[PDB]
Design a protein around this ligand. Structure first.
Ligand SMILES: Cc1ccc(O)c(O)c1CC[C@@H]1C(=O)CC[C@]2(C)C(=O)CC[C@@H]12
Ligand SMILES: Cc1ccc(O)c(O)c1CC[C@@H]1C(=O)CC[C@]2(C)C(=O)CC[C@@H]12
Ligand SMILES: Cc1ccc(O)c(O)c1CC[C@@H]1C(=O)CC[C@]2(C)C(=O)CC[C@@H]12
Ligand SMILES: Cc1ccc(O)c(O)c1CC[C@@H]1C(=O)CC[C@]2(C)C(=O)CC[C@@H]12
Ligand SMILES: Cc1ccc(O)c(O)c1CC[C@@H]1C(=O)CC[C@]2(C)C(=O)CC[C@@H]12
Ligand SMILES: Cc1ccc(O)c(O)c1CC[C@@H]1C(=O)CC[C@]2(C)C(=O)CC[C@@H]12
Ligand SMILES: [Fe+2]
Ligand SMILES: [Fe+2]
Ligand SMILES: [Fe+2]
Ligand SMILES: [Fe+2]
Ligand SMILES: [Fe+2]
Ligand SMILES: [Fe+2]
Lengths: 298, 298, 299, 299, 299, 299
């Protein structure tokens, strides 16, 4: 059907205490109920967790989990993966119980970022209330989007578009020097990927990161929610990556800020919806309409 | 096309007089014109009957009738049934006249609840007016939904989803003890089934009942209609199964009450509509958002 | 302009720990700052407090507070009290500071019920977030309504309608023998008054109560918020006074429960709004369309 | 404020069994409770009765009842009757109890047509459910309209517009020779009055009728409700007075039929609503856009 | 209430056959019934006539007719004319019969322009169907607007605004030397007046015209109706005065053409509507946003 | 009627080249025609100028200009100034020609702040097109708002509310010790006034400024227009006074920056609109919901 949205992200961390206070006091997410080691479960809506943090010696991406509509929809991904020759494994009894899904397959892309593709998640039904009064925009758009590293842009395009069936939604070139090529280069390509109306749920920057993550975006309903988060971040001396601005691409009004795992979170609103029957995949030539001053890091 | 909705229910009863007064004074349905033995015909809209009660020595389900769009739509069900090897029979001349349909096939599932699958019903056109002023919600959603018993959940899923072509809309686990397994069990699964936008028209609880029915739901337009029915039920000392509440699943605002056939009726409003192009089949972990206190039986 | 809405309610209480637990875990209101020791401010929205609970020896109503649009709307109420000769005091500096208003007058109706009419309240701006996810319905409808006790319904009709300017919105007759009177001769009236679109902000029953108060109604956005409350209340063993129902007059979908003060709170949604330009004052002949079984049950 | 709408109509009748059968099986109204023996209460909505039928020796109109918003709206009507010197009586205790109102004044217009102006009516709250599935259109438009007979149209214009405050909404001229007058010299006027958005609540024809009444109009929601009525009426052999049509002035889609009192009822839908702030009083020159063939036919 | 709109225009004409042909084949109006011999009634809607053309020796305006809501709205205009001492006559019986109104007063403004203020017009109810498929825009906006000639703009301002109660809606200055005055010293003003939401019903130019009239504007629903008219007019060799354009003040999309009377008709759509509660009277400094090239061309 | 909105602002300036560059390249306003040598007209819409900048020796406010609906709305303001004995002069012929208005009166409030109240302004009709693609929000809300300096807040309250008729829309208390007063005893008030739906057109701070002006606010349609401005301002090295935020009182999403006059301009969107019939004048206790960090930073 087929992948349909970003379901969860599992990350590994060296500072579980900082994650807990950043997730609860800056992001205004809600902590989920146990939660093994722990192991922090961060909640946005009726999913048992969207952001799962497990303790370890590295600050990195473990898995990205991707929701399908049903059993048939997972089978479609299986059939595609076999057609290409991508090795994949069924979740073990213990993995299904842990993620709380009916079926799941595990595999990596050629970079290899690890993927979990699943169907039949459990939901928790008590209202999830942020103490700051914002609601996240999830539903049919899913969790948010993730921008990850790739070792090779053309190879990512192949895997995500041709093998897995994402749609190419947007493309932006990088000057050859920024990816270590001679100024004489081939530019390289940052490509954005859609699986549902959310402009993108996924993108591949062909430059390295230590975590494997460039940014995670989560969306709230209103500008005020973004603005109030900015103030909570500033008050807690969270480092800023980009100033408030509006994207050209997805029309998201957002700021970026460093998380305790070293990568950025984009916290935004007003994200653009895409119909695949109308959409023309083209190249954008700027990141923002205004704002998003990425020089603010240093 | 293919099954499209719940058309009617035929039940057998030991107390025809209690049915008549419950159907007319509590449910505010209208009695249809003859009506063999009798045989009570209960009406909700322009169908000649939705709930047909025939006298006998048991309080049980006889058949569930399922409407298709047309001749081609019934043929599609025939072709599916032959593909699996399910024996089925054409209605006799006398059966077609009795149900008042153009074509119908008779068969049972592996449990075997008996099914009638038909097209080309007659309608009656005089306004059907409840003396209590409510209107039932039928139309493209059909009669309502029925929760029946199954001897085996996985076998029901097969028959209904893979053979007949219902969509899996929702799934809820039962602890192993409640179905007679050791506390060490496999949980068993209550699975909800859709054939049109009505969240579900059918569900299978894998625990026995004497009638074969767990509940029949009928929907009215407004909360007030539900509330007024509650008061009519209480006044007539109808026993309650669950208190007013809201479902997690289908978002139905409803109460359950025992009928004269021993099974419950859920009388509700505000039921959720589902688009199969968007819908993610997931597992719910609670029955209600609030209310629906099922301890009220004893 | 006139009085425009119900602003706040100040009550006295014998169990402060029970009110805090109630206010917070059943009602889902939010604690304000920084009431006197150990008074309790309970918030619904950007009012510094809508329900103020102060320690004492009775469970009783102290004052109902009534909001005016501005200084001139308050003057119009002085002028009306003067025409009648109704005594009123201007608030003291400490009272203004305490209530967080710019002006305020105090008086009592003829049954001794105490009013504070004010304008120019401070507001607090950080979002009030119920742990339970509901939002209250206030704004131009104000905090809700209050049903108080009265000694004489004809004297109250005159004070509230003719002197103060509320509009009579509905009336319901009560049997002469359950007021203490014969079985021939005049009924007693429950009268519902409004000062804004909320069908009623005020009603008066001529029947005696220990606290001064027959009920406080607070309104939430949706049926789900009412059902989730009822469920918290049942879990916390709160005594029920009336089952869920829908009223005939204001079409409120609500249930009633006993508070730590032993008066009811009505917790409801879907309240009907009234335009004075077309509204006909009539007599209702039932409490409910359906439910609201007071048998469960007090009083 | 003023009179705001038509409340009820009380008629006298020679055949009570025929009116009950009519009221119930043709009109699809609902029987109320518990009229005097063997009076008939016919209900459209939550009014205890809108058409009250009492046993007698004639088929005639007894009183038209006119609803005011509240006590002060009734006082405004006293004050207007006093300015003119129009005699009126206050209702007795038994009359108040009988009509289920809080106050009521009785008088007559100069042709002797009797009015009851009231406020504070009781309502009944259990759903009124027509066996035929239609809903009537009442609310702020009230029960409907009535076309009565008048002796002098200029005296009626003054009483109804100038003394009582209805607005003139439309006028239609009638030939001088079908009033009894020459063939040179002045026409007689049919004048349509309103007191709310319903294009008219009241009209007066200067032409004689046995009953006092030219017609009663009641309004249902949709065309289908009108067509289904017409069909019940044809099945019950009710005498038709005018075929289905659409009026020019109120754009009512309606037919006319004879009642057991021998006056017409107009049964219609799609009535036009009027805002007094922009409404121009003019003269219509036809009854209908189409249909309404009175040839079928009375009178 | 006051004058509420422009009702009708009566003009005198030297060529009756040309006006009928124009009225009917260019304007797409419909012939009314049964004007005097051989006067011409031209209809836009249910008014018996909106443009009445009578045989004579000049092409001139006879009277502008102005509609009031009712008898009391007409009295308010008498009262205003009396305060000023402006002479007016009541209409005669034959005049009432002729104009098909219930009351009417005649007077002239200080430049001698003749007004008929009326209420209680007859309407005709069979559908007025333009052979060309357009509908005119009238209703509460009335027949359209008229730009007349004035001797003194300050005297007209006083008569129309202060005595009669139109609102000043816009003003446009005219060069002192094209009024006949020096080159130092005061401009002359074109003033636009309204009595309903139509941006203007009346304007006055202090510049001389043979007919009394600078222009008549009539409004149709859509741009297509304007373009189809222009095309009939070009086919019939009607002299153009101004090409299609959009006005700055009323945002009318219109063209101007010469009539058989030699004054212009403006034929337009999309006229802007005004609410007096927020409308600011200002000065425009151009006729058009675009087009309306009067060079084509008269005058 | 009264004053209806803020019309224009006239300021004096020491650097004219800096204001032109600012006005044009940061604000995205459009240059008007043909101001005196070398005065600067800055346009937002069809007003000939909304911000008029004239060469001088200080950066100061000269006059705020206030628009009335018509001649009679201006008379109502004369009448109010007369009741108080407030001196005002009628404008001279050259002043009328210069301001492009029909009438105008000049006076000063009791702190010496100079007002020009006018009606009958000329408009210019060719589209005003910002090079940056934004549209300003003016119309019935007028040019924006201005926060001026005051010597006494109680005297200003009386002048602006009681004499001139603005409505008090909000109030915010300021610490007694940052006005120069003790630490016991009375706060000073920031008061926000409005004359139309724009939450405020005018506010007064009792704190000293070199220019007369605390800030000018101008409003654009959307958040994107604000963000694109901020970006032009950062590129042009304009000094920031307050970061982007949302106000508590008018829900304006805006940032503040220093102008070439050294007073702030607030550049914002999403301003809340007020209906006087339901608006309650209250006290706010924060500047912002979020952002608006004045630390960045002046003053
Ligand atoms: C460039 C861009 C376009 C559209 C988006 O929705 C979006 O998130 C981005 C940013 C992706 C990416 C990032 O987050 C880290 C810093 C990067 C490499 C840049 O400086 C340009 C693109 C940036
Ligand atoms: C559990 C549930 C979820 C969603 C629904 O729409 C719905 O009707 C139900 C109830 C089904 C079922 C029942 O009616 C009898 C008592 C049962 C076994 C329970 O106590 C839980 C589920 C119940
Ligand atoms: C009748 C009624 C209508 C609308 C309301 O909002 C509302 O609170 C009521 C109830 C009034 C009153 C009460 O508060 C306590 C118990 C009373 C006396 C009853 O037993 C019936 C009316 C009740
Ligand atoms: C003309 C008319 C317009 C609107 C109405 O609602 C309406 O009832 C009428 C009819 C008035 C009147 C009547 O009732 C009996 C028969 C009459 C006299 C006719 O023959 C024409 C007008 C009719
Ligand atoms: C300027 C104007 C605005 C709105 C209108 O509806 C409208 O008719 C006009 C035109 C007024 C006037 C005219 O009728 C004849 C020729 C005139 C004098 C011109 O040449 C410019 C203004 C014109
Ligand atoms: C508080 C406020 C609310 C709504 C407004 O539109 C608005 O401009 C303000 C700001 C008022 C005022 C100012 O202009 C300069 C700096 C001030 C004194 C502050 O530091 C807080 C309030 C500010
Ligand atoms: Fe992003
Ligand atoms: Fe159910
Ligand atoms: Fe209540
Ligand atoms: Fe009628
Ligand atoms: Fe014109
Ligand atoms: Fe501001």
């Amino acid at each position: 059907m087929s992948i349909r949205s970003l379901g969860y992200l599992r990350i590994e961390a060296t500072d579980m205490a900082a994650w807990r206070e950043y997730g609860l006091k800056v992001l205004g997410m809600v902590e989920g109920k146990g939660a093994p080691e722990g192991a922090l479960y961060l909640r946005m809506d009726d999913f048992p967790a969207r952001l799962v943090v497990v303790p370890g010696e590295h600050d990195r991406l473990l898995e990205a989990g991707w929701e399908c509509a049903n059993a048939e929809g997972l089978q479609e991904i299986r059939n595609r993966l076999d057609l290409e020759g991508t090795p994949y494994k069924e979740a073990t009894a213990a993995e299904l119980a842990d993620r709380r899904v009916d079926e799941m397959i595990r595999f990596a892309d050629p970079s290899g970022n690890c993927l979990e593709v699943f169907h039949g998640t459990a939901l928790e039904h008590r209202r999830v209330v942020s103490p700051y009064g914002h609601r996240f925009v999830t539903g049919e758009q899913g969790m948010g989007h993730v921008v990850l590293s790739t070792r090779d842009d053309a190879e990512a395009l192949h895997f995500y578009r041709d093998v897995l069936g994402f749609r190419l939604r947007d493309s932006m070139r990088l000057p050859p020097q920024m990816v270590g090529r001679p100024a004489d280069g081939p530019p390289a390509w940052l490509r954005f990927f859609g699986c549902n109306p959310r402009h993108h749920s996924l993108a591949f920057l062909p430059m390295p990161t230590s975590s494997g993550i460039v940014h995670l975006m989560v969306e709230v309903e209103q500008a005020d929610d973004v603005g109030l988060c900015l103030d909570r971040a500033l008050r807690r001396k969270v480092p800023m990556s980009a100033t408030l601005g509006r994207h050209v691409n997805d029309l998201m009004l957002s700021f970026y800020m460093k998380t305790p795992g070293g990568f950025d979170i984009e916290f935004g609103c007003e994200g653009r919806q895409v119909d695949d029957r109308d959409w023309i995949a083209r190249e954008s030539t700027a990141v923002s309409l205004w704002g998003h001053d990425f020089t603010v890091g240093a």
